[model samples]
Target: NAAAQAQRQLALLEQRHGVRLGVQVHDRDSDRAFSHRADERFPMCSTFKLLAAGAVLARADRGDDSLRRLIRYGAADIVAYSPVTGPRQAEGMTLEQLCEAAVTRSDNTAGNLLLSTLGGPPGLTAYARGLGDRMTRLDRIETALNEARPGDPRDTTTPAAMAGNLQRLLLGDALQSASRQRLADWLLASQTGDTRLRAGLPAGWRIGDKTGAGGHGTNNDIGVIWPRDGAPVLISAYLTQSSASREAQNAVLAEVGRIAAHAVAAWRLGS
Candidate 1:
């Protein structure tokens, strides 16, 4: 019944928006869930920053890098997509602050700096692949700003793989405790995606996520939702190549979150 509820909500969203969507919702504790077009690749946009963050943090945990070290946002790091860090590129910030801004604010300059710190896209791809996420690929930085490449699979990931990456991080499968905790902190503080998955949840429930928006009708949110009385649920929702407006796509994500929260609540209560 829970799966059916989620499935129906997704169907309604697709019908309403006339968009292609990929969704994956998993019960982190039980590894049970639902999916639609979960394996289909979509341009990841900023969502790849999550993978980048993880890779960087893993190294920090290993003592190979330092989050406490300060780095100036050089002129070269400035990008059109970073509202929070673009103007402040001349200001000094700790590596931790950059990482936080990268996730929380979806700041493109912060992400690029982090990518540079982690040895670029190749480093992220290797770390992700080692974690068993096969469908994710990051070939370059976020140079195109918010403009989307609808059918391009480069710098993309499947919904299933994105969800799996979050799951692994939560279960301690790929990251040490310190790195994993920092990742959680970043996700919890994310300032983006408020109109999407986090928007529909009930009060007091914590939703930690990252948002990705590219021009050309591409949007995504992937993260874990923690209910006050139940275990967390991992959700990765992607909408791309849509005819709908960005507002419409966000509404779809909000509805999906609402349906998922209700179904998970019911399932947990054994009702």
Candidate 2:
């Protein structure tokens, strides 16, 4: 009943919201299900941080690697934020800190900062290609940065590939062993609390993710959710231009979270 009903409701929500979504449920015990737009590519917003993270970890795995490696912030790293950070707050955060902030708080400053650390715009895309993630692209960090660049396009990624990359990392197959563990910890430290992936779990759910919002109503989130039993479920959920309000974004997240919670509940009940 829940399976059919959830599918019907998910379909209705997708139609009503005028957007696409990709979701997967792993029971951690051989039982799992899948749904929607999983292979479709979309602007990743800050969720591209995962790609950035993977890239950063790969750098760390390069034998002489270091996340503590200092990255200088020039005028390019500075930006004016009237609302979020309030008028010119981007500055002086290391790749490790910036990556953590980008995930935890979805800080734009952190996103751009990490973009610079990973070689600004082009490096991350290169990193994606090297990782064999074909459905993703990293043009620039965010809207303000994109505006500043003008010619530079923002980055994009598909849920299927992004989620797969994360899952691989979890299985000790993504980056070097030590580097992968460290990357997992950094991702867990992310402060972004916006929507999509995180919205689906309980208050204390151990979900690590990043949120992105910008042009043409783009909203996206991707994260790894560790259930109590077996393998973790990698979630990538996105909504493009659903609404202009921050509350609308949160609502989008809440709806997605509800379905995810149900999926987890089903697994627990073994129904």
Candidate 3:
């Protein structure tokens, strides 16, 4: 269950950010969440990495032998809109490393490369479907180079769906057990947290997550909340076209993350 100490903190956050927050939280091993925003969806950003990570894991789980396989990338292999991956640097990457870079570094190039390896947006969407993320989908790859086909749509998810998918991944219900631990392990190592999901936490709490931001005014994140000496919770928060100024939009998004983090942290501490 979420910490009661952070309840007021969330309200305070709502006040500061000027946008109502959508939240979903799950208690340890609960079939239903202790708190939920069940039908709400937002742009999943790197939070979608959870699915991408699972996709790679699923491939390996299905006997594809990608776990030890190497993905070689060239400038041509680089998907547009992704800056984290480079051409010559793609010579030798383990499937595990690819997932890590995508989640931990929020590497667009890495993600696009993986998407390519998985057969592009269709592959990612199918993979998410396989993991039961029906409301979760990757309609196109949103990158700087704009790899999306002309008139293609954007990737998206609901707060509930994001939380649910993460919950399923955490619970090992999203895929076969053989690769579940591996997926979870990669999520725990994620490093892309400075925005939508982790913006509000205190200095020392343990939180691991991935983030997604787009020029389309999309800001999103989904991850686990672990406060020292308190309960663990899962949350997904998202935003889009919420501001006109890219700077202001990003600021608002970071504020959203901070507020949510603060709320959850306070709830956990009962302060």
Candidate 4:
């Protein structure tokens, strides 16, 4: 019944928002779950940063790159939507720190830096496909902020693919232990999406997540939630092509989180 409950909740949210939602919730313990349009592709926005980080870290694990490398930031590197490097006085940061800023702050400048350092989106996509996720693909770096257009191709992936990749990372199949630890730390410290999935979680539940916002109408929050005494729950929620405001969209995401948390709690009680 958790599957039924989740479906009901997601369907209700879709009805209320008049938007298409792609969702996937998987219990690593129960190995049971359900999905809504899980295979439908949605614009990833900054969520693609996760794949870029993974590619860079995986290469570091293989000694192809070093996290200790330092990158100088001049006025030329400044981008409009960077929280980490924007308005900051720092002239440079380590590769490790760039990766951190990319994930935790969703720093556009940092993301562009890391993407170039990791051999660009094509390289990252190749690395992602190598990890068994063919649906996760990146087309370009962060150049301009805008919503997904009808004929425009941008970085895109399905909820199922995003959830599956997170599951693989949780299972230690994506990176070396050290590299994995660095990424884990960043996700745990991520400051974006507090009003999304993070807002709906119950007390004492740990969430390591990444949020993506495409300028006008696309928003997504996908990651894993760990209960105090049970296995982690992986959730990938994508709200795309909405005419609603960000506040309305985020409310939908929070409702998804609430539904998921309730299901996990019920499972814990029965187990």
lDDT of 3 by residue, 69-143 (tens): 777777765655344566336465767777877877777777876777787888888877776778766766646
State the lDDT at 117 in candidate 2: 64
Winner by lDDT between candidate 3 and candidate 1: 1
Off by over 4 Å in 1: 145-147
TM-score of 3: 0.76
- lDDT per residue as tens, model 4, 1-271: 7778778888988887888888999887677778899998888888887777877788788899899998887777787678777665266888888888888888888888888876787877787788888887777778563456543556788999989888777555688888777887888898798899989999888888899888548899988888777788999998887898889899989998898888777766763
Please write out the lDDT profile of model 1 over residues 107-181, one tens digit for every residue: 888888888887778877887898898878788787753455766767888999998899888655678887888
Candidate 1 root-mean-square deviation in Å: 1.7
**TM-score result, candidate 1:** 0.93
Better of 3 and 4 by lDDT: 4
lDDT for model 2 comes to 0.62
The TM-score that candidate 4 achieves is 0.94
Tens digit of lDDT per residue, candidate 2, span 1-271? 5555556666777777765555544434445655566676666666776676677767777744577865555555445331222233444445666555555556666666666667877888777777677766676556543221212335656667776677676554668788677666766765555455566576656766666666566666666776545466666676664545766766766677678667766766766
Regions of model 2 farther than 4 Å from truth: 1-5, 24-28, 80-91, 144-154, 194-196
> How are the candidates ranked when ordered by lDDT, highest leading?
1, 4, 2, 3
**TM values, all candidates:** 0.93, 0.80, 0.76, 0.94
Q: Which is better, 1 or 2, measured by TM-score?
A: 1
What is the RMSD of candidate 4? 1.8
